[PDB]
Amino acid sequence: KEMVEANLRLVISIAKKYTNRGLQFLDLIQEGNIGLMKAVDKFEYRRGYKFSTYATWWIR
DNA sequence: GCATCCGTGAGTCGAGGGTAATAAGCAGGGATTCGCCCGGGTGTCAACTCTTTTTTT
């Protein structure tokens, strides 16, 4: 929960690009939060040492 | 006891006729759906036997 709350503002930058496509802003933010919470479960010390590099794919 | 801020209203019949924009990718496994075909129940016909109303004797 702490890790998903620390990177909560990262999804707002990705959700801003997708707009006026049939979904409101809050719904897109909630979907991005779902994706981020689903991506935080699997994160090891792989080639990508930044959590954002692995979370952006799941959020998108 | 007053001053400031948030809802309702606006006639009625007629014409005029349709609209419009963003845009990842691929691997696994199931549920769905379209072609062919055997088939058994529904139709469409050759073709064998009682009854009888006269029409003939």
Distance A13 CA to B6 C1' (A): 37
Exp. method: cryo-EM
Question: Which residues contact residue A10 at a Cβ distance below 8 angstroms, ignoring those fewer than 6 apart?
Answer: A36, A52, A55, A56, A59
Q: Rounded to an integer, what distance in angstroms lies between the CA atom of residue A28 and that of residue A21?
A: 10
Residue A57's nearest nucleotide, by CA–C1', is: B24
Q: What are the CA-CA distances from residue A50 to residues A7, A24, A35, A38, A53 (Å)?
A: 11, 29, 17, 16, 6
Compute the C-alpha angle A55/A2/A60, nearest 5°: 20
- Structure-token pair, residue A50: 């930044």
Question: Which residues contact residue A11 at a Cβ distance below 8 angstroms, ignoring those fewer than 6 apart?
Answer: A29, A32, A33, A35, A36, A59
Residue A60's nearest nucleotide, by CA–C1', is: B24
User: Exposed, middle or buried, A5 (CB in 10 Å: 0-12/13-18/19+)?
Assistant: exposed
Distance A45 CA to B7 C1' (A): 60
- Structure-token pair, residue A24: 């409101």
Q: What is the resolution of this structure in A?
A: 3.7
Residue A18's nearest nucleotide, by CA–C1', is: B22
